[model samples]
Target: LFTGVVPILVELDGDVNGHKFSVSGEGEGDATYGKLTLKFICTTGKLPVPWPTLVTTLVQCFSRYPDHMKQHDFFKSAMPEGYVQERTIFFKDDGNYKTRAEVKFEGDTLVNRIELKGIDFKEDGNILGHKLEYNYNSHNVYIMADKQKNGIKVNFKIRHNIEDGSVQLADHYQQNTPIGDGPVLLPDNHYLSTQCALSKDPNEKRDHMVLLEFVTAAGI
Candidate 1:
């Protein structure tokens, strides 16, 4: 399998703090070595000083910048514009088939929905399945997974409230299961617990925590 020598290159483009930024890197051999170039430009010339020069000087000005580079605000600054407006989720079963879920903004709320057909769940019932709808708004997020209307096997409503940090599950069949109300308990990780602690709006912190707890508990 001998062949001609070949090199590897990776290119990246995105926006940071509403500014355009790009990166180009050339390397080979498991990415152990390479030459990388990053360029940052102002979108509206809002900053008085030369943007490129300021960035390069800042990079050179720091002696130990690794930890500084990992700061949350720094990464947030690198996030592209409108990233929070949309998200897509993809799923695949053990049989190699795939499905996808989509979330999009509709007015003031985010709608999360997934749909599929011809899903067979053995030992319970042989019928079509695969449907879900969840919505996220200012105070809470609610999800419902429903199978066919005829003798459905799996169906439930789950809701999480941001203000009170409460998770409520209303499973119609499992009335005896004591999986009731609970406070949102985030992991002890410093980065996660404090990620939104200092947000300008106090409500933002609660929303972030509630979202994390819901996703973790639901294994989503």
Candidate 2:
């Protein structure tokens, strides 16, 4: 059942497109007794590699080509055979406490899937967030710490298969990892962003990005 006329808590707007999972939470209370969990899963499609990776990616791809088909020129010199495969996971924490997020892509290809996962994401920084852990309770389940905290500890896990392109989160590991190779930090008053290429194919500009942010609800 739905509840009655709660105040119109928010009025928001943004220009976005493609498959999107927008998550947000806000609250008012004393700190402690719940942690925030944020997870992002992405399978890549052909996308443009960021500038920093452009040269290196092409160099890697060019090695496979015959020497007769290559040139000394840079951008215009040698065109690679394979297309660049890419994926990105982004996180943001507005210093003031209000967060923002979105996932975007041009074409609707199967390999180009974007999703936001996890639980207890709160927008209120004043309240202490939850700590997440899992225990075997049946098929599978997660348990979180509900008391006392300060900043946070994070981890990142990246899994991909080039042999057949089979990548996903199962019961545990890729088995999508709980702790990963890149654990992003969102220090208060600080903001960060990054882009990465999964392969050496640096062209094909399908531009895919997963933007995530955490913000306080007091933005009135």
Best lDDT among the predictions, by candidate number: 1
Name the 10 consecutive residues with the lowest summed lDDT in model 2.
1-10
**Candidate 1: what lDDT?**
0.20
Residue-level lDDT of model 2, residues 1-220, one tens digit each, is 0012111111112111222233222211110111111122122433211211111111011111123322211111111111122222221221111112121112321111122222222433111121111111111111121113211222222222222343311222100111222222222221111122223224524332222122111101
Model 1, span 70-166: residue lDDT tens: 3312111212110111111111220111112222323432222222111222222111121211222121112222123111121222231222343
User: In candidate 1, where is summed lDDT lowest over 10 consecutive residues?
Assistant: 55-64
How large an RMSD does model 1 have? 22.5
Global lDDT of each candidate? 0.20, 0.19
Alpha-carbon error at 11 in model 2, in Å? 26
For model 1, what is the error of residue 81's alpha carbon versus the real structure, in angstroms, after optimal superposition?
Answer: 10
lDDT for position 89 in model 2: 28
